[PDB]
Amino acid sequence: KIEEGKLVIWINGDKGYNGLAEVGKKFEKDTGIKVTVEHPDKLEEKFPQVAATGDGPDIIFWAHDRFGGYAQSGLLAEITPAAAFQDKLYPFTWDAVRYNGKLIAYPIAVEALSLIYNKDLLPNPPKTWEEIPALDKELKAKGKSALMFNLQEPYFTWPLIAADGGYAFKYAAGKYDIKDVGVDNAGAKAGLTFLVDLIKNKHMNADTDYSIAEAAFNKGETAMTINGPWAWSNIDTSAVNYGVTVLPTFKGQPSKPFVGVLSAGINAASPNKELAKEFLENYLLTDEGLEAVNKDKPLGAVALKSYEEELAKDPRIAATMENAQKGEIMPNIPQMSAFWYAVRTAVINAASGRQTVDAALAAAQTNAARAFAAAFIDEHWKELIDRVNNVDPILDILRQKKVITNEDYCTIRNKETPQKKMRELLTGPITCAGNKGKEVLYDALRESNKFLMDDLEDLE
Ligand SMILES: OC[C@H]1O[C@H](O[C@H]2[C@H](O)[C@@H](O)[C@@H](O)O[C@@H]2CO)[C@H](O)[C@@H](O)[C@@H]1O
């Protein structure tokens, strides 16, 4: 399990993890408690898997939107800061980590996407998305491009989808309504259509990811990118003279980035909860602790009032907060991971021309409102049939969980190969047991065909 008397921290590989480890070394010097900082790939999807068995890190860092799902699953310990400490952070950052009345993490920093532009290539950046096609034509004439940013993560394309009316879950009467999903209204369709036309007309490439866009901007090959504060450090190191500014408007409306509060949660299974509290409150969330992390990769606008007063004078932070004000704080509700998966699928499918914009967003509207696991099954059902090897345990689990009947079990168990059993299952009783039946099937697959499931989720 988790080792007593030391701290293991998980944080994403784009953050200042080397600066965070320096805070860990100061902690160990004063206490004898070793602190190990790791940056596993896809840690936000690995954490609920390993923590459910009592494993994982003592502390997990991620934007707050994932933490409601974690807390609903019982994976996070309640945060209990004294009043003098709670006063040290902005109250709105505490609101981001409150779930069902309860603080479930320590807020660290406010993150929002901005437009980043090369001041030597583009002395005045475009105020509107609509002018970017013409700008790209001009820059292609000179051997450059207008704009490159990560098209593989919906976090980066959401500001444009939301600009003219898209939204995740409608907020009303103090609660999010998982009905009013707004990923398929006229504003969302217009934004994704504009994005998809950029790719169609060869102003962007559907295969551009984080590293490709970062490399191109930092080599001076593209005039603009979209990124967060963590990216400024690498541009500082490049030769690019860059500015950070408000995102372009679409149909006269501001782009609306989803605002994330980088947060540190304590594993409910950790035997080191008191050491973790001490590290986070007395070492990390101080002027010198946050400065060490921020010097490695900028955090954005920090939750710690005393340090934020210094950072707020940076014009790049002013741009971050200007974009933050035009966007929305992300919900932390458990449905957020289903929302993100739905929008990720829609953008990839529409950008490749595999689906029309309208069909992509119609699926996203349905998928955002149901469990992640159900959409996962529906999106991989052909691969499941072709690759599963171990079907009898699945049937046993489905029968004992009452998804299928005794007759179903005997009928399917009688077939000769795993592919035939799986096809009868997926086109028979699994189509008839709602989303819940597909969620039970997903759990059964992870108990019986874990490598297949890990590979399909790209966790291996
Ligand atoms: O793209 C979906 C993704 O968006 C957000 O993740 C951000 C994260 O907040 C930033 O700190 C940075 O690491 O970039 C990520 C996008 O690659 C959500 O926090 C995340 O839950 C969601 O899956």
mmCIF file of N, CA and C and ligand atoms in Angstrom, residues 12 14-15 44 62-66 111 113 150 152-156 210 227 230 260-262 330 336-337 340-341 344, ligand 1:
data_model
loop_
_atom_site.group_PDB
_atom_site.id
_atom_site.type_symbol
_atom_site.label_atom_id
_atom_site.label_comp_id
_atom_site.label_asym_id
_atom_site.label_seq_id
_atom_site.Cartn_x
_atom_site.Cartn_y
_atom_site.Cartn_z
ATOM 1 N N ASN A 12 0.965 16.745 -12.588
ATOM 2 C CA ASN A 12 1.081 16.613 -14.035
ATOM 3 C C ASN A 12 2.436 17.097 -14.545
ATOM 4 N N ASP A 14 3.380 18.861 -16.954
ATOM 5 C CA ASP A 14 3.584 20.219 -17.436
ATOM 6 C C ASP A 14 3.758 21.235 -16.307
ATOM 7 N N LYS A 15 3.594 20.835 -15.044
ATOM 8 C CA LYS A 15 3.728 21.760 -13.928
ATOM 9 C C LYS A 15 5.154 21.767 -13.378
ATOM 10 N N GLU A 44 -4.669 11.543 -13.768
ATOM 11 C CA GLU A 44 -6.006 11.863 -13.289
ATOM 12 C C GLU A 44 -6.986 10.732 -13.533
ATOM 13 N N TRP A 62 -4.267 18.232 -9.209
ATOM 14 C CA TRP A 62 -4.929 18.383 -10.502
ATOM 15 C C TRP A 62 -5.852 19.589 -10.402
ATOM 16 N N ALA A 63 -6.289 20.090 -11.560
ATOM 17 C CA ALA A 63 -7.377 21.063 -11.553
ATOM 18 C C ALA A 63 -8.578 20.516 -10.785
ATOM 19 N N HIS A 64 -9.346 21.427 -10.177
ATOM 20 C CA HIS A 64 -10.406 21.040 -9.247
ATOM 21 C C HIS A 64 -11.538 20.253 -9.904
ATOM 22 N N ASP A 65 -11.673 20.301 -11.236
ATOM 23 C CA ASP A 65 -12.875 19.734 -11.844
ATOM 24 C C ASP A 65 -12.951 18.224 -11.643
ATOM 25 N N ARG A 66 -11.801 17.546 -11.494
ATOM 26 C CA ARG A 66 -11.782 16.099 -11.273
ATOM 27 C C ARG A 66 -12.132 15.692 -9.843
ATOM 28 N N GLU A 111 -5.883 28.904 -13.076
ATOM 29 C CA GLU A 111 -5.335 28.654 -14.406
ATOM 30 C C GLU A 111 -6.372 29.013 -15.457
ATOM 31 N N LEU A 113 -6.574 29.752 -19.993
ATOM 32 C CA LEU A 113 -5.873 29.863 -21.265
ATOM 33 C C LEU A 113 -5.857 31.313 -21.736
ATOM 34 N N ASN A 150 -3.005 22.894 -29.266
ATOM 35 C CA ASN A 150 -3.330 21.484 -29.056
ATOM 36 C C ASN A 150 -4.791 21.235 -29.415
ATOM 37 N N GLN A 152 -6.003 18.118 -29.632
ATOM 38 C CA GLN A 152 -6.347 16.800 -29.119
ATOM 39 C C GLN A 152 -7.035 16.842 -27.759
ATOM 40 N N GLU A 153 -6.927 17.953 -27.026
ATOM 41 C CA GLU A 153 -7.561 18.086 -25.712
ATOM 42 C C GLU A 153 -8.666 19.135 -25.772
ATOM 43 N N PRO A 154 -9.909 18.780 -25.427
ATOM 44 C CA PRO A 154 -11.022 19.726 -25.597
ATOM 45 C C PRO A 154 -10.894 20.968 -24.724
ATOM 46 N N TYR A 155 -10.083 20.915 -23.665
ATOM 47 C CA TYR A 155 -9.741 22.106 -22.887
ATOM 48 C C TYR A 155 -9.318 23.268 -23.785
ATOM 49 N N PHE A 156 -8.577 22.982 -24.859
ATOM 50 C CA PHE A 156 -8.055 24.057 -25.701
ATOM 51 C C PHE A 156 -9.062 24.555 -26.736
ATOM 52 N N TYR A 210 -0.010 18.911 -28.256
ATOM 53 C CA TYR A 210 0.615 19.895 -27.383
ATOM 54 C C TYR A 210 2.058 20.158 -27.802
ATOM 55 N N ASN A 227 -2.359 28.700 -24.782
ATOM 56 C CA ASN A 227 -1.766 27.896 -23.725
ATOM 57 C C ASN A 227 -1.925 28.599 -22.386
ATOM 58 N N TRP A 230 1.752 27.695 -17.358
ATOM 59 C CA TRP A 230 2.842 26.728 -17.260
ATOM 60 C C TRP A 230 3.738 26.760 -18.491
ATOM 61 N N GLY A 260 -9.669 26.629 -14.318
ATOM 62 C CA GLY A 260 -9.296 25.533 -13.442
ATOM 63 C C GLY A 260 -8.506 26.041 -12.248
ATOM 64 N N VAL A 261 -8.802 25.487 -11.086
ATOM 65 C CA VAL A 261 -8.037 25.783 -9.888
ATOM 66 C C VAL A 261 -7.180 24.563 -9.600
ATOM 67 N N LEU A 262 -5.880 24.690 -9.864
ATOM 68 C CA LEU A 262 -4.949 23.643 -9.484
ATOM 69 C C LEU A 262 -5.077 23.410 -7.986
ATOM 70 N N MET A 330 -14.777 26.001 -13.783
ATOM 71 C CA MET A 330 -15.324 24.690 -14.091
ATOM 72 C C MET A 330 -16.146 24.179 -12.911
ATOM 73 N N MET A 336 -18.214 15.636 -14.621
ATOM 74 C CA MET A 336 -17.271 16.397 -15.452
ATOM 75 C C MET A 336 -16.417 15.496 -16.343
ATOM 76 N N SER A 337 -15.986 14.330 -15.849
ATOM 77 C CA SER A 337 -15.141 13.506 -16.711
ATOM 78 C C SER A 337 -15.920 12.951 -17.908
ATOM 79 N N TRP A 340 -16.036 15.887 -20.410
ATOM 80 C CA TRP A 340 -14.778 16.076 -21.122
ATOM 81 C C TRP A 340 -14.550 14.991 -22.172
ATOM 82 N N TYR A 341 -14.872 13.734 -21.843
ATOM 83 C CA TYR A 341 -14.736 12.644 -22.805
ATOM 84 C C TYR A 341 -15.663 12.852 -24.004
ATOM 85 N N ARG A 344 -14.251 15.662 -26.130
ATOM 86 C CA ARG A 344 -13.026 15.216 -26.791
ATOM 87 C C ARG A 344 -13.349 14.372 -28.020
HETATM 88 O O1 LIG B 1 -8.851 18.570 -22.115
HETATM 89 C C1 LIG B 1 -9.671 18.064 -21.068
HETATM 90 C C2 LIG B 1 -9.057 18.333 -19.690
HETATM 91 O O2 LIG B 1 -9.040 19.731 -19.440
HETATM 92 C C3 LIG B 1 -8.521 20.126 -18.179
HETATM 93 O O3 LIG B 1 -7.172 19.729 -18.093
HETATM 94 C C4 LIG B 1 -6.178 20.714 -18.260
HETATM 95 C C5 LIG B 1 -5.621 21.074 -16.885
HETATM 96 O O4 LIG B 1 -6.607 21.701 -16.096
HETATM 97 C C6 LIG B 1 -4.408 21.998 -16.991
HETATM 98 O O5 LIG B 1 -3.777 22.054 -15.721
HETATM 99 C C7 LIG B 1 -3.404 21.498 -18.034
HETATM 100 O O6 LIG B 1 -2.682 20.421 -17.507
HETATM 101 O O7 LIG B 1 -4.012 21.084 -19.253
HETATM 102 C C8 LIG B 1 -5.072 20.154 -19.151
HETATM 103 C C9 LIG B 1 -5.582 19.919 -20.573
HETATM 104 O O8 LIG B 1 -4.678 19.049 -21.217
HETATM 105 C C10 LIG B 1 -9.297 19.458 -17.048
HETATM 106 O O9 LIG B 1 -8.737 19.789 -15.792
HETATM 107 C C11 LIG B 1 -9.274 17.947 -17.224
HETATM 108 O O10 LIG B 1 -10.030 17.334 -16.195
HETATM 109 C C12 LIG B 1 -9.846 17.595 -18.590
HETATM 110 O O11 LIG B 1 -9.807 16.187 -18.776
#
